[PDB]
Design a protein around this motif. Structure first.
Motif, PDB file in Angstrom:
ATOM      1  N   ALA B 241     -64.860  -2.265  32.459  1.00  0.00           N
ATOM      2  CA  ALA B 241     -64.699  -3.616  32.934  1.00  0.00           C
ATOM      3  C   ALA B 241     -63.741  -4.402  32.095  1.00  0.00           C
ATOM      4  O   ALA B 241     -62.879  -5.093  32.620  1.00  0.00           O
ATOM      5  N   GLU B 242     -63.836  -4.269  30.791  1.00  0.00           N
ATOM      6  CA  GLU B 242     -62.894  -4.936  29.918  1.00  0.00           C
ATOM      7  C   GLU B 242     -61.479  -4.479  30.100  1.00  0.00           C
ATOM      8  O   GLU B 242     -60.558  -5.294  30.100  1.00  0.00           O
ATOM      9  N   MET B 243     -61.261  -3.192  30.316  1.00  0.00           N
ATOM     10  CA  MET B 243     -59.920  -2.709  30.605  1.00  0.00           C
ATOM     11  C   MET B 243     -59.395  -3.351  31.846  1.00  0.00           C
ATOM     12  O   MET B 243     -58.238  -3.757  31.914  1.00  0.00           O
ATOM     13  N   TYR B 244     -60.163  -3.366  32.914  1.00  0.00           N
ATOM     14  CA  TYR B 244     -59.736  -3.964  34.154  1.00  0.00           C
ATOM     15  C   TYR B 244     -59.546  -5.441  34.018  1.00  0.00           C
ATOM     16  O   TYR B 244     -58.579  -5.959  34.565  1.00  0.00           O
ATOM     17  N   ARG B 245     -60.414  -6.140  33.308  1.00  0.00           N
ATOM     18  CA  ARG B 245     -60.243  -7.545  33.097  1.00  0.00           C
ATOM     19  C   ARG B 245     -58.950  -7.855  32.393  1.00  0.00           C
ATOM     20  O   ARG B 245     -58.188  -8.696  32.813  1.00  0.00           O
TER      21      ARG B 245
END
Ligand SMILES: O=c1[nH]c(=O)n([C@@H]2O[C@H](COP(=O)(O)O)[C@@H](O)[C@H]2O)cc1F
Ligand SMILES: O=c1[nH]c(=O)n([C@@H]2O[C@H](COP(=O)(O)O)[C@@H](O)[C@H]2O)cc1F
Lengths: 257, 257
Positions: B241-245
């Motif tokens: 999720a952090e990568m995508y964010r």
């Protein structure tokens, strides 16, 4: 040229669910699908029992049943078997294949476990069919593609409709017909089911438009009328169903000659 | 020209739900919508809690939750409020208005009671919006119209897409944006949310096609990425999720200049 429903039931490429449907249509002299748009299971079931003999199909929207359980669907199946009608959940799957397969098999409703027929919008492309098929083929189910809609402003026209027909014809092991306002496929193995039907002219306040059974079956060449409020809102729903049945059946006969 | 999400939150014609969303996007530096495509409530909730800080929105398919109850949705709301994200039920209403209003308010899911946002296909014509509005406006909810789809063979192109944009722009008291693959409206009050997103090239076996956050946000001008499997199937869903964010947020910043 045109074949009776009983003869269509025998066509080489007929799908088994279509064949079962066509056979009971012929046997019972009904091409009426009741749209059982009610929120109470008891009403659903009481309509299914009383109107079962008059219908070839009962269309559900399980997601408006306030008191849905799988046991309600068991009871509906018992009625469907007793009275000989198919159960069609008008779910309008309309998602990527990976999603719709889960929506069809799983969740609280377990639609594939009880619905002989479901439908799908074709807007996502054929993956919607492929996904549904992965669940429905093993369960011996059928699907209807929404080629046209009854409502004002429908975009299911022209090339969209043609795409729906192609998609059906290319997935005939699972797709058994259409929701449409008219005959859209020239192939007699496909069923045409038409909503937006009432005896009287009119429409609702939220874009529904009505045409009569004679127009839809007789002039526009469809097979089955789907009727909700024209029956459901009537006092005597059995008599209403009989009126619609007789209307659609005679229109069919006369078109057959 | 282009405005930040925070400034868009203030636009005269902004819908309150859009404004709330845009504000939390700006505050949290996230334009990621998690597609929580899971079948277990506990997993849903554990993802919502852990990933809540990283997302602006959590998209549900309630109809695949094996153990849906309204209490699960209560718990999800608590998490949404705690972590500041909207709940979007990806129901894809796609029926005549009279039907969808009941599907939105009623049944087992009571979607309108918990979903900040829902979406609709535009194929039925604007009655789909009008019907939903009758429930959603009093409940202060918003809707997204599906203007484009991510899947192979999508028919949501050309004039269909244009019709979706018109329908949105004409129902701005309820319609707050789109599901689309790109910016489709030139009006900055509308949100663009794009599914079919992964960091790596590819697609699934049922017609899903993927593009990267940089492509979708950066080149195609969308606002929010909707990511399911790219996060859900990863071992560490928080890191994913952090990568995508970070990917979507930087793409947004860079496009803003
Ligand atoms: O194009 C369509 N029009 C419809 O009306 N329907 C459904 O048929 C039913 C029509 O009900 P009525 O009460 O006869 O208008 C209702 O359940 C609709 O959701 C489906 C469609 F696909
Ligand atoms: O055009 C669309 N494409 C989509 O993929 N979706 C949803 O986004 C999600 C995509 O998940 P993925 O796992 O990232 O492919 C999934 O829930 C889909 O139903 C919705 C759409 F409207």
């Amino acid at each position: 040229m045109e074949l009776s429903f009983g003869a269509r039931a025998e066509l080489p490429r007929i799908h088994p669910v279509a064949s079962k449907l066509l056979r009971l249509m012929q046997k019972k002299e009904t091409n009426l699908c009741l749209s059982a748009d009610v929120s109470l299971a008891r009403e659903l079931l009481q309509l299914a029992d009383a109107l079962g003999p008059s219908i070839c199909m009962l269309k559900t929207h399980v997601d408006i049943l306030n008191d849905f359980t799988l046991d309600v669907m068991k009871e509906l199946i018992t009625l469907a078997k007793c009275h000989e009608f198919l159960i069609f959940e008008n779910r309008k799957f309309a998602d990527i294949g990976n999603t719709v397969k889960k929506q069809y098999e799983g969740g609280i409703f377990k639609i594939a476990s009880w619905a002989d027929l479901v439908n799908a919008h074709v807007v996502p492309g054929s993956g919607v069919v492929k996904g549904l098929q992965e669940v429905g083929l093993p369960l011996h189910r059928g699907c209807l593609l929404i080629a046209e809609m009854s409502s004002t402003g429908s975009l299911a026209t022209g090339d969209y409709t043609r795409a729906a027909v192609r998609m059906a014809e290319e997935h005939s092991e699972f797709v058994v017909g259409f929701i449409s306002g008219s005959r859209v496929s020239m192939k007699p193995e496909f069923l045409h089911l038409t909503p937006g039907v009432q005896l009287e002219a009119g429409g609702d306040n939220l874009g529904q438009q009505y045409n009569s059974p004679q127009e839809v079956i007789g002039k526009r060449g469809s097979d089955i009328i789907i009727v909700g409020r024209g029956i459901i809102s009537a006092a005597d729903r059995l008599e209403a169903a009989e009126m619609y049945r007789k209307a659609a059946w005679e229109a069919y006969l006369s078109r057959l000659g």
